[PDB]
Amino acid sequence: YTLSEKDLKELDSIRDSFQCMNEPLDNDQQASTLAKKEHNPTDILNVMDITMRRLVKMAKRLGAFNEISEAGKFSLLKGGMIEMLTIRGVTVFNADKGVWQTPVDGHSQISFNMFDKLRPDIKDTQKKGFLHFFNLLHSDVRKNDLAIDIIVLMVLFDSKREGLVSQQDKETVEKLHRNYESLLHRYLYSIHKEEAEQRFASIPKALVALRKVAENAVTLFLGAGNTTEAASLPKEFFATNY
Amino acid sequence: KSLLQQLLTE
Ligand SMILES: C[C@H](CCC[C@@H](C)[C@H]1CC[C@H]2[C@@H]3CCC4=CC(=O)CC[C@]4(C)[C@H]3CC[C@]12C)C(=O)O
C-alpha cells in the first residue's frame, strides 16, 4: 500500500539532496551557453560542467555518502559520473522534438544532433545507445523524479568500481546499494502497484545498457576539434587531445 | 591535483 513514515523521511532526505539539480543558474555565462541556438563540442562541455558540479553537490549533501572514505568518494564519483549524467539526460529528453530541455532554464534546448560533431566513428553507436537506454526506461518511471533519483543513487553506490579497495567501503557501498534498491521496490509499489513488479524487474536490464553506453562515451570528444576553451571538470571524465 | 578531488575536499 502506502509508504511508511520511515520511508517518507528517507524520501524527504533524497528530495533535499537532489533539490540543487533543478535550481536556477546563478552565472550568466552558463545561462548564455544554454541559450545558444547551436552548441558546438566546447559548448556541450560547458553545459556538462553545470550538471557535473551539481551532481557533486548532491553527493556531498548525502548522509550515506559521508559513511565512505575520502578515497572511496573520489572513486565512486570518478566512476559513476558519466552514468549519472546519462540518466539525467534521459529525464530531460524530448524524444518528439529530439532535443534536451533543462528544467532549470525553459526556452532552452540542446539538439540531439550535437552528436554529429563528436568522435566520427563512434558517434552513431552512441546516439543509438542513448536512445536505447531511454527507451528501456518506461514513461512512468522516467517522469517520476524520486524514482530516478533513487536509481541515480543505485548507480552511484556501485561496489565494483575501480578505486574501491577498502573492504569497509565495499561493504558499506553494497549495503547502501541493497537498501536503495529495496526502497525503489517499495516505492514503485506505492505509486503504481499495477505494474510494479514488472517495472522494477526491468530497471536492472536498463542499467546494464546504461553502463554500456556510458562506458564507450569517454572518447566522444576525440576528433571533435579544439576544446581548450571548455570547462576543465568535464575534461577529467572525457578524453581530449587538447 | 584534480578538480574532482578539490571539489570533494572543499
Ligand atoms: C545544465 C543541464 C542541461 C541539460 C542537458 C544535459 C542533460 C545533456 C547535455 C549534454 C548531454 C550528454 C552528451 C554526451 C553523452 C554521450 C553519451 O553517449 C551518453 C550521454 C551523454 C553523457 C549526454 C547526457 C546528457 C547531457 C549531459 C541541466 O539542466 O541538467
Nearest to A88 by CA among A29, A28, A153: A153
Among left, alpha and beta (phi > 0; psi -120 to 50; other), residue A69 is: beta
Residue whose grid cell is 546494464: A208
Q: Which DSSP symbol is given to A110?
A: E
Q: What angle do the packed helices A5-18 and A167-191 form, to 10 degrees? A: 110
Nearest 10 degrees: Cα torsion A34, A39, A44, A48 = 10
**What sections of chain A are H helices per DSSP?**
5-18, 28-35, 41-60, 70-91, 123-136, 139-142, 145-156, 167-191, 196-215
Q: Contacts for A181-185 with beta carbons within 8 Å, 24 or more apart?
A: A181/A154, A183/A7, A183/A10, A183/A150, A184/A147, A184/A150, A184/A151, A184/A154
Distance CA A111, CA A3 (A): 39
Instruction: Please give the single-letter amino acid code of residue A148.
Output: I
State how far residue B8 is from chain A, nearest Cα, in angstroms: 7
State the cell numbers at A207: 542499467
- B4 to A74: CB separation less than 8 angstroms, yes or no: yes
Using an 8 Å CB-CB cutoff, list residues of chain A that contact chain B: 53, 56, 60, 70, 73-74, 77-78, 232-233, 236
Length in residues, chain B: 10
The CATH number for A1-242, chosen from 3.40.50.2300, 1.10.357.10, 1.10.565.10, 3.30.390.50, is 1.10.565.10
What experiment produced this structure?
X-ray
Residue whose grid cell is 533513487: A150
Distance CA A166, CA A161 (A): 11
Which run of H or E residues covers position A94?
Answer: strand A93-94
* Residues from chain A contacting residue B9 (CB–CB below 8 Å): 70
Do residues A194 and A106 make contact, with C-beta atoms less than 8 angstroms apart? no
Q: How far, in Å, from the CA of A172 to the mean position of ligand 1?
A: 30
Do residues A229 and A44 make contact, with C-beta atoms less than 8 angstroms apart? no
Do residues A54 and A20 make contact, with C-beta atoms less than 8 angstroms apart? yes
Nearest to A236 among B4, B8, B9 (CB): B4
Residue whose grid cell is 546504461: A210
Domain ranges of chain A: 1-242
Residue whose grid cell is 568522435: A119
Distance CA A209, CA A117 (A): 23
Distance CA A47, CA A49 (A): 5
The CA angle A50-A82-A226, to the nearest 5 degrees, is 65
State how far residue A237 is from chain B, nearest Cα, in angstroms: 10
- B3 to A78: CB separation less than 8 angstroms, yes or no: no
Atom of ligand 1 lying closest to residue A92 CA? 7
Best residue for ligand 1 mutational test, from A48, A110, A132, A213 (most atoms within 8 Å of Cβ):
A48
What is the b/e burial string over A101-138, where b = at least 16 CB atoms within 10 angstroms of the residue's CB? Answer: ebebbeebbbebebbebbbeebbeebbebbbebbebbb
H, E, C per residue of A158-213: CCCCCCCCCHHHHHHHHHHHHHHHHHHHHHHHHHCCCCHHHHHHHHHHHHHHHHHH
